[PDB]
Amino acid sequence: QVQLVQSGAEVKKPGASVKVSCKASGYTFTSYYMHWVRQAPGQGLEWMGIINSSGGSTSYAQKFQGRVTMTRDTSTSTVYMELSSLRSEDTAVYYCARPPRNYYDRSGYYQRAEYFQHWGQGTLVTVSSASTKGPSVFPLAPSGTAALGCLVKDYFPEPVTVSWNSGALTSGVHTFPAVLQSSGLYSLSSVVTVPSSSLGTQTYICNVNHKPSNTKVDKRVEPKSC
Protein backbone atom coordinates (compact mmCIF):
# COMPACT_ATOMS: atom_id res chain seq x y z
CA GLN A 1 0.00 0.00 0.00
CA VAL A 2 1.33 3.45 -0.95
CA GLN A 3 0.75 6.23 1.57
CA LEU A 4 1.47 10.00 1.55
CA VAL A 5 0.77 11.70 4.89
CA GLN A 6 1.07 15.50 5.05
CA SER A 7 1.50 17.80 8.05
CA GLY A 8 -1.33 19.46 9.99
CA ALA A 9 -3.21 22.55 8.84
CA GLU A 10 -1.54 25.81 9.85
CA VAL A 11 -2.54 29.47 10.14
CA LYS A 12 0.09 32.12 9.44
CA LYS A 13 0.05 35.94 9.49
CA PRO A 14 0.36 37.67 6.06
CA GLY A 15 3.96 37.98 4.87
CA ALA A 16 5.19 34.99 6.88
CA SER A 17 6.31 31.58 5.59
CA VAL A 18 4.72 28.12 5.80
CA LYS A 19 6.38 24.72 5.67
CA VAL A 20 4.28 21.71 4.68
CA SER A 21 5.55 18.16 5.21
CA CYS A 22 4.80 15.06 3.15
CA LYS A 23 5.94 11.69 4.51
CA ALA A 24 6.01 8.77 2.06
CA SER A 25 5.59 5.12 3.06
CA GLY A 26 5.10 1.83 1.23
CA TYR A 27 7.59 2.32 -1.61
CA THR A 28 11.29 3.06 -2.01
CA PHE A 29 11.28 6.82 -1.50
CA THR A 30 14.40 7.67 -3.48
CA SER A 31 13.09 6.34 -6.81
CA TYR A 32 10.35 8.83 -7.74
CA TYR A 33 9.86 12.56 -8.33
CA MET A 34 7.57 14.49 -5.97
CA HIS A 35 5.33 17.27 -7.28
CA TRP A 36 3.39 19.92 -5.34
CA VAL A 37 -0.09 21.15 -6.27
CA ARG A 38 -1.97 24.02 -4.62
CA GLN A 39 -5.74 24.52 -4.74
CA ALA A 40 -7.41 27.71 -3.56
CA PRO A 41 -10.88 27.32 -1.94
CA GLY A 42 -13.41 27.14 -4.77
CA GLN A 43 -10.73 27.57 -7.44
CA GLY A 44 -9.00 24.89 -9.49
CA LEU A 45 -5.68 23.08 -9.19
CA GLU A 46 -2.45 24.97 -9.76
CA TRP A 47 0.97 23.43 -10.26
CA MET A 48 3.86 24.51 -8.06
CA GLY A 49 6.94 22.47 -8.91
CA ILE A 50 8.85 19.22 -8.91
CA ILE A 51 11.59 17.92 -6.64
CA ASN A 52 13.90 14.95 -7.18
CA SER A 53 13.84 12.82 -4.05
CA SER A 54 17.25 11.30 -4.87
CA GLY A 55 19.57 14.21 -5.62
CA GLY A 56 17.43 17.19 -4.58
CA SER A 57 17.27 18.78 -8.05
CA THR A 58 14.31 21.18 -8.15
CA SER A 59 12.20 22.93 -10.79
CA TYR A 60 9.61 25.50 -9.66
CA ALA A 61 6.95 27.24 -11.75
CA GLN A 62 7.65 30.80 -12.89
CA LYS A 63 4.69 31.99 -10.79
CA PHE A 64 6.28 30.76 -7.58
CA GLN A 65 9.91 31.25 -8.60
CA GLY A 66 11.79 32.98 -5.78
CA ARG A 67 9.15 32.33 -3.09
CA VAL A 68 8.86 28.51 -2.96
CA THR A 69 11.56 26.10 -1.76
CA MET A 70 11.39 22.29 -1.87
CA THR A 71 13.41 20.21 0.63
CA ARG A 72 14.00 16.45 0.99
CA ASP A 73 15.13 14.10 3.78
CA THR A 74 15.95 10.54 2.70
CA SER A 75 16.43 9.06 6.16
CA THR A 76 12.83 9.86 7.12
CA SER A 77 11.52 9.58 3.54
CA THR A 78 9.87 13.01 3.66
CA VAL A 79 9.47 16.07 1.41
CA TYR A 80 9.13 19.65 2.67
CA MET A 81 7.73 22.64 0.77
CA GLU A 82 8.15 26.20 2.04
CA LEU A 83 6.20 29.18 0.70
CA SER A 84 7.34 32.66 1.79
CA SER A 85 5.79 36.15 1.59
CA LEU A 86 2.23 34.89 1.93
CA ARG A 87 -0.69 36.98 0.71
CA SER A 88 -4.46 36.53 1.01
CA GLU A 89 -4.42 34.57 -2.26
CA ASP A 90 -2.20 31.87 -0.73
CA THR A 91 -4.95 30.60 1.59
CA ALA A 92 -5.31 27.18 -0.04
CA VAL A 93 -4.85 23.43 0.31
CA TYR A 94 -1.45 22.01 -0.58
CA TYR A 95 -1.06 18.48 -1.91
CA CYS A 96 2.03 16.41 -2.60
CA ALA A 97 1.76 13.97 -5.50
CA ARG A 98 3.91 11.16 -6.88
CA PRO A 99 3.94 10.26 -10.60
CA PRO A 100 5.42 6.95 -11.91
CA ARG A 101 9.05 6.64 -12.95
CA ASN A 102 10.22 8.33 -16.15
CA TYR A 103 11.15 5.83 -18.84
CA TYR A 104 13.38 5.82 -21.92
CA ASP A 105 11.92 5.41 -25.42
CA ARG A 106 12.89 2.62 -27.80
CA SER A 107 14.94 5.27 -29.65
CA GLY A 108 16.53 6.42 -26.40
CA TYR A 109 14.32 9.50 -25.99
CA TYR A 110 13.65 10.58 -22.39
CA GLN A 111 9.86 10.23 -22.11
CA ARG A 112 8.42 11.91 -18.99
CA ALA A 113 5.28 10.39 -17.46
CA GLU A 114 3.84 13.14 -15.26
CA TYR A 115 0.46 11.76 -14.22
CA PHE A 116 -0.29 11.73 -10.50
CA GLN A 117 -1.26 8.28 -9.20
CA HIS A 118 -0.85 8.90 -5.47
CA TRP A 119 -1.78 12.06 -3.54
CA GLY A 120 -1.51 13.30 0.04
CA GLN A 121 -4.51 14.21 2.20
CA GLY A 122 -3.86 17.95 1.82
CA THR A 123 -2.60 20.67 4.17
CA LEU A 124 -4.75 23.76 4.65
CA VAL A 125 -2.78 26.98 4.99
CA THR A 126 -4.94 29.82 6.25
CA VAL A 127 -3.26 33.16 5.74
CA SER A 128 -4.72 35.33 8.45
CA SER A 129 -4.01 37.83 11.18
CA ALA A 130 -6.56 36.13 13.41
CA SER A 131 -5.42 34.33 16.53
CA THR A 132 -6.01 30.58 16.78
CA LYS A 133 -8.84 29.54 19.10
CA GLY A 134 -9.99 26.17 20.39
CA PRO A 135 -13.51 24.82 19.72
CA SER A 136 -16.38 24.16 22.11
CA VAL A 137 -18.30 20.93 21.57
CA PHE A 138 -21.99 20.78 22.52
CA PRO A 139 -24.52 17.90 22.26
CA LEU A 140 -27.57 18.11 20.02
CA ALA A 141 -29.93 15.72 21.81
CA PRO A 142 -32.94 14.02 20.11
CA SER A 143 -36.51 13.96 21.47
CA GLY A 144 -39.11 5.53 13.78
CA THR A 145 -35.52 6.79 13.47
CA ALA A 146 -34.08 9.74 15.41
CA ALA A 147 -31.18 12.09 14.63
CA LEU A 148 -28.51 13.30 17.06
CA GLY A 149 -25.53 15.58 16.58
CA CYS A 150 -22.54 17.56 17.81
CA LEU A 151 -22.02 21.31 17.52
CA VAL A 152 -18.42 22.52 17.14
CA LYS A 153 -18.61 26.24 17.93
CA ASP A 154 -16.08 29.10 17.95
CA TYR A 155 -12.92 27.60 16.47
CA PHE A 156 -10.18 29.02 14.25
CA PRO A 157 -8.77 28.14 11.87
CA GLU A 158 -10.15 25.44 9.61
CA PRO A 159 -10.52 22.54 9.69
CA VAL A 160 -11.91 20.18 12.34
CA THR A 161 -12.09 16.38 12.05
CA VAL A 162 -15.33 14.85 13.31
CA SER A 163 -15.76 11.09 13.67
CA TRP A 164 -18.40 8.97 15.38
CA ASN A 165 -17.63 6.14 17.81
CA SER A 166 -13.92 6.40 16.95
CA GLY A 167 -14.82 5.81 13.29
CA ALA A 168 -17.13 2.84 13.91
CA LEU A 169 -20.13 4.79 12.57
CA THR A 170 -20.11 6.08 8.98
CA SER A 171 -23.61 5.17 7.74
CA GLY A 172 -25.83 8.27 7.73
CA VAL A 173 -23.21 10.71 9.01
CA HIS A 174 -23.48 14.28 7.71
CA THR A 175 -20.67 16.64 8.72
CA PHE A 176 -21.76 20.09 7.56
CA PRO A 177 -19.22 22.55 6.06
CA ALA A 178 -17.94 25.23 8.41
CA VAL A 179 -19.59 28.64 8.63
CA LEU A 180 -17.66 31.85 9.26
CA GLN A 181 -19.60 33.64 12.02
CA SER A 182 -19.78 37.40 12.55
CA SER A 183 -17.11 37.05 15.26
CA GLY A 184 -14.57 35.85 12.68
CA LEU A 185 -14.65 32.33 14.18
CA TYR A 186 -15.89 29.12 12.53
CA SER A 187 -18.73 26.81 13.58
CA LEU A 188 -19.79 23.41 12.29
CA SER A 189 -22.35 20.69 13.03
CA SER A 190 -22.17 16.95 12.49
CA VAL A 191 -25.38 14.92 12.61
CA VAL A 192 -26.14 11.20 12.37
CA THR A 193 -29.49 9.39 12.07
CA VAL A 194 -29.88 6.16 14.05
CA PRO A 195 -32.91 3.93 14.88
CA SER A 196 -34.71 4.89 18.10
CA SER A 197 -34.33 1.26 19.28
CA SER A 198 -30.57 1.79 19.63
CA LEU A 199 -31.07 5.01 21.66
CA GLY A 200 -30.77 2.96 24.86
CA THR A 201 -28.73 0.02 23.52
CA GLN A 202 -25.75 1.69 21.79
CA THR A 203 -23.82 4.70 23.10
CA TYR A 204 -23.02 7.48 20.62
CA ILE A 205 -19.72 9.34 21.03
CA CYS A 206 -18.57 12.10 18.70
CA ASN A 207 -14.84 12.78 18.41
CA VAL A 208 -13.79 16.32 17.48
CA ASN A 209 -10.15 17.00 16.62
CA HIS A 210 -8.75 20.49 16.01
CA LYS A 211 -5.04 20.01 15.29
CA PRO A 212 -4.05 23.73 15.00
CA SER A 213 -5.14 24.16 18.63
CA ASN A 214 -4.15 20.64 19.78
CA THR A 215 -7.73 20.14 20.99
CA LYS A 216 -9.31 16.69 21.14
CA VAL A 217 -12.80 16.39 22.63
CA ASP A 218 -14.91 13.25 22.91
CA LYS A 219 -18.56 13.86 23.71
CA ARG A 220 -21.25 11.31 24.51
CA VAL A 221 -24.67 12.33 23.19
CA GLU A 222 -27.39 11.21 25.59
CA PRO A 223 -31.10 12.10 25.32
CA LYS A 224 -32.27 14.81 27.73
CA SER A 225 -34.97 13.21 29.91
CA CYS A 226 -37.52 15.89 30.81
Partner: protein, 215 residues
Protein backbone atom coordinates in the same frame (compact mmCIF):
# COMPACT_ATOMS: atom_id res chain seq x y z
CA UNK B 1 35.56 33.00 34.45
CA UNK B 2 34.81 36.61 35.49
CA UNK B 3 32.38 37.57 32.74
CA UNK B 4 28.97 39.26 32.89
CA UNK B 5 25.58 37.94 31.94
CA UNK B 6 23.05 40.45 30.88
CA UNK B 7 19.77 39.05 29.62
CA UNK B 8 19.50 40.14 25.98
CA UNK B 9 15.90 41.25 25.81
CA UNK B 10 14.21 43.39 28.34
CA UNK B 11 10.94 45.02 27.48
CA UNK B 12 8.57 47.30 29.32
CA UNK B 13 5.52 49.55 29.03
CA UNK B 14 5.27 53.37 29.43
CA UNK B 15 4.94 54.61 33.01
CA UNK B 16 6.03 51.19 34.33
CA UNK B 17 9.48 50.35 35.68
CA UNK B 18 11.93 47.87 34.15
CA UNK B 19 14.71 46.12 36.08
CA UNK B 20 17.70 45.07 33.96
CA UNK B 21 20.04 42.55 35.58
CA UNK B 22 23.83 42.18 35.25
CA UNK B 23 25.15 39.05 36.93
CA UNK B 24 28.82 38.53 37.73
CA UNK B 25 30.92 36.58 40.21
CA UNK B 26 32.39 37.40 43.61
CA UNK B 27 35.64 38.57 42.00
CA UNK B 28 34.11 41.25 39.77
CA UNK B 29 30.64 42.46 40.78
CA UNK B 30 30.13 40.77 44.15
CA UNK B 31 33.32 41.94 45.84
CA UNK B 32 33.79 45.55 44.75
CA UNK B 33 31.53 48.54 44.15
CA UNK B 34 32.70 49.74 40.73
CA UNK B 35 29.77 49.16 38.40
CA UNK B 36 28.69 51.34 35.49
CA UNK B 37 25.61 51.38 33.25
CA UNK B 38 25.81 52.84 29.74
CA UNK B 39 22.91 53.60 27.41
CA UNK B 40 23.56 53.51 23.67
CA UNK B 41 21.06 54.33 20.93
CA UNK B 42 21.77 52.51 17.62
CA UNK B 43 24.23 54.61 15.61
CA UNK B 44 25.17 56.86 18.55
CA UNK B 45 28.00 56.77 21.08
CA UNK B 46 27.38 55.25 24.56
CA UNK B 47 26.30 57.60 27.34
CA UNK B 48 26.98 57.11 31.03
CA UNK B 49 23.83 56.59 33.12
CA UNK B 50 25.25 55.14 36.34
CA UNK B 51 28.80 55.45 37.68
CA UNK B 52 29.14 53.31 40.81
CA UNK B 53 26.76 50.79 42.30
CA UNK B 54 24.34 53.72 42.59
CA UNK B 55 25.29 57.19 41.37
CA UNK B 56 23.56 59.30 38.69
CA UNK B 57 25.94 61.76 36.93
CA UNK B 58 25.03 65.38 36.14
CA UNK B 59 22.34 65.33 33.46
CA UNK B 60 20.88 61.84 34.00
CA UNK B 61 17.16 61.85 35.02
CA UNK B 62 16.28 60.51 38.47
CA UNK B 63 14.23 57.76 36.76
CA UNK B 64 17.38 55.68 36.28
CA UNK B 65 18.36 54.14 39.61
CA UNK B 66 21.18 51.64 40.08
CA UNK B 67 21.41 48.96 42.77
CA UNK B 68 23.32 45.82 43.70
CA UNK B 69 22.53 42.55 45.45
CA UNK B 70 25.14 39.86 46.03
CA UNK B 71 26.64 39.12 42.60
CA UNK B 72 23.93 40.89 40.58
CA UNK B 73 23.73 44.59 39.74
CA UNK B 74 20.41 46.01 38.59
CA UNK B 75 19.41 49.17 36.74
CA UNK B 76 15.82 50.31 37.28
CA UNK B 77 14.20 52.65 34.78
CA UNK B 78 11.18 54.48 36.17
CA UNK B 79 8.57 56.38 34.17
CA UNK B 80 9.46 54.63 30.92
CA UNK B 81 9.38 56.79 27.79
CA UNK B 82 9.93 56.08 24.09
CA UNK B 83 13.40 57.65 24.37
CA UNK B 84 14.50 54.83 26.69
CA UNK B 85 14.37 52.35 23.78
CA UNK B 86 18.10 51.65 23.50
CA UNK B 87 20.87 49.16 24.27
CA UNK B 88 22.01 49.08 27.90
CA UNK B 89 25.48 47.75 28.80
CA UNK B 90 27.00 47.12 32.24
CA UNK B 91 30.70 47.38 33.08
CA UNK B 92 32.54 46.27 36.23
CA UNK B 93 35.94 46.06 37.86
CA UNK B 94 37.39 42.60 37.24
CA UNK B 95 40.75 43.37 38.86
CA UNK B 96 43.74 45.70 38.43
CA UNK B 97 44.09 46.24 34.67
CA UNK B 98 40.82 44.47 33.85
CA UNK B 99 37.43 45.98 32.97
CA UNK B 100 34.59 43.75 31.80
CA UNK B 101 31.51 44.74 29.80
CA UNK B 102 28.20 42.89 29.51
CA UNK B 103 26.32 41.44 26.53
CA UNK B 104 23.80 44.26 26.46
CA UNK B 105 20.04 44.49 26.95
CA UNK B 106 17.82 45.77 24.17
CA UNK B 107 15.09 47.60 26.06
CA UNK B 108 11.84 47.78 24.11
CA UNK B 109 9.15 50.29 25.11
CA UNK B 110 5.75 48.71 24.67
CA UNK B 111 3.42 51.54 23.65
CA UNK B 112 3.73 50.96 19.91
CA UNK B 113 1.74 52.97 17.34
CA UNK B 114 2.06 50.92 14.14
CA UNK B 115 3.06 53.27 11.31
CA UNK B 116 2.73 52.89 7.55
CA UNK B 117 6.01 52.95 5.54
CA UNK B 118 6.87 56.15 3.68
CA UNK B 119 8.29 55.07 0.31
CA UNK B 120 10.25 57.09 -2.27
CA UNK B 121 11.34 55.67 -5.63
CA UNK B 122 14.15 57.21 -7.66
CA UNK B 123 14.84 56.26 -11.32
CA UNK B 124 18.41 56.04 -12.74
CA UNK B 125 20.38 59.22 -13.40
CA UNK B 126 21.31 60.46 -16.86
CA UNK B 127 25.00 60.24 -15.95
CA UNK B 128 24.61 56.61 -14.86
CA UNK B 129 22.69 55.72 -18.02
CA UNK B 130 25.51 57.39 -19.99
CA UNK B 131 27.87 55.01 -18.15
CA UNK B 132 26.02 51.89 -19.39
CA UNK B 133 24.58 51.25 -15.92
CA UNK B 134 21.27 51.83 -14.13
CA UNK B 135 20.06 51.64 -10.55
CA UNK B 136 16.54 52.00 -9.19
CA UNK B 137 16.47 53.26 -5.59
CA UNK B 138 13.60 52.47 -3.22
CA UNK B 139 13.86 54.23 0.15
CA UNK B 140 11.56 53.31 3.04
CA UNK B 141 11.35 55.46 6.18
CA UNK B 142 9.19 56.00 9.26
CA UNK B 143 7.59 52.57 9.66
CA UNK B 144 6.92 50.37 12.69
CA UNK B 145 7.53 47.57 13.41
CA UNK B 146 10.81 47.07 11.52
CA UNK B 147 9.56 44.27 9.27
CA UNK B 148 8.97 45.01 5.58
CA UNK B 149 9.20 42.92 2.40
CA UNK B 150 10.33 44.45 -0.88
CA UNK B 151 9.20 43.27 -4.32
CA UNK B 152 10.22 44.53 -7.76
CA UNK B 153 7.85 44.34 -10.71
CA UNK B 154 8.69 44.69 -14.40
CA UNK B 155 5.42 46.16 -15.75
CA UNK B 156 3.53 43.47 -13.82
CA UNK B 157 6.02 40.63 -13.37
CA UNK B 158 8.44 40.02 -10.45
CA UNK B 159 12.20 40.55 -10.83
CA UNK B 160 14.35 38.67 -8.31
CA UNK B 161 17.76 39.29 -9.92
CA UNK B 162 19.99 42.29 -9.17
CA UNK B 163 18.13 43.23 -5.96
CA UNK B 164 20.02 44.35 -2.84
CA UNK B 165 17.81 45.17 0.16
CA UNK B 166 19.25 46.40 3.47
CA UNK B 167 18.26 45.14 6.89
CA UNK B 168 15.87 47.56 8.73
CA UNK B 169 17.63 49.94 11.13
CA UNK B 170 16.15 52.09 13.89
CA UNK B 171 15.99 55.85 13.20
CA UNK B 172 16.32 58.72 15.68
CA UNK B 173 12.53 59.10 15.90
CA UNK B 174 12.23 55.47 17.11
CA UNK B 175 10.81 54.35 13.74
CA UNK B 176 12.64 52.19 11.19
CA UNK B 177 14.23 52.83 7.79
CA UNK B 178 15.49 50.64 4.97
CA UNK B 179 16.76 50.96 1.40
CA UNK B 180 16.59 48.65 -1.63
CA UNK B 181 18.62 49.01 -4.81
CA UNK B 182 17.84 47.29 -8.12
CA UNK B 183 20.84 47.22 -10.44
CA UNK B 184 19.80 47.04 -14.10
CA UNK B 185 21.19 47.70 -17.59
CA UNK B 186 19.98 50.73 -19.64
CA UNK B 187 18.47 48.25 -22.11
CA UNK B 188 16.27 46.65 -19.43
CA UNK B 189 15.36 50.12 -18.16
CA UNK B 190 14.31 51.57 -21.52
CA UNK B 191 12.65 48.33 -22.70
CA UNK B 192 9.84 48.32 -20.11
CA UNK B 193 6.73 50.50 -19.73
CA UNK B 194 7.29 51.06 -16.00
CA UNK B 195 9.05 49.55 -13.01
CA UNK B 196 7.52 49.35 -9.56
CA UNK B 197 8.74 48.92 -5.99
CA UNK B 198 6.21 47.31 -3.63
CA UNK B 199 6.65 47.43 0.15
CA UNK B 200 4.51 45.03 2.20
CA UNK B 201 4.15 45.82 5.91
CA UNK B 202 1.77 44.15 8.39
CA UNK B 203 -0.57 42.98 5.62
CA UNK B 204 -0.71 46.45 4.04
CA UNK B 205 1.09 47.33 0.79
CA UNK B 206 2.53 50.48 -0.75
CA UNK B 207 3.46 50.64 -4.44
CA UNK B 208 5.60 53.22 -6.20
CA UNK B 209 6.05 53.23 -9.99
CA UNK B 210 8.62 54.87 -12.27
CA UNK B 211 8.85 55.25 -16.05
CA UNK B 212 11.59 56.49 -18.47
CA UNK B 213 11.59 60.06 -19.83
CA UNK B 214 12.32 60.92 -23.48
CA UNK B 215 11.59 63.77 -25.92
Amino acid sequence: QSALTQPPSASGSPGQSVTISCTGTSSDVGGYNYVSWYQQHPGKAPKLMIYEVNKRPSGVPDRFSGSKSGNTASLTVSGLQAEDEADYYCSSYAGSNNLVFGGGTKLTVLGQPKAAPSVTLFPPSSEELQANKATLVCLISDFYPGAVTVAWKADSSPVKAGVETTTPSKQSNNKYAASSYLSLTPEQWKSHRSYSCQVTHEGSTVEKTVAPTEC
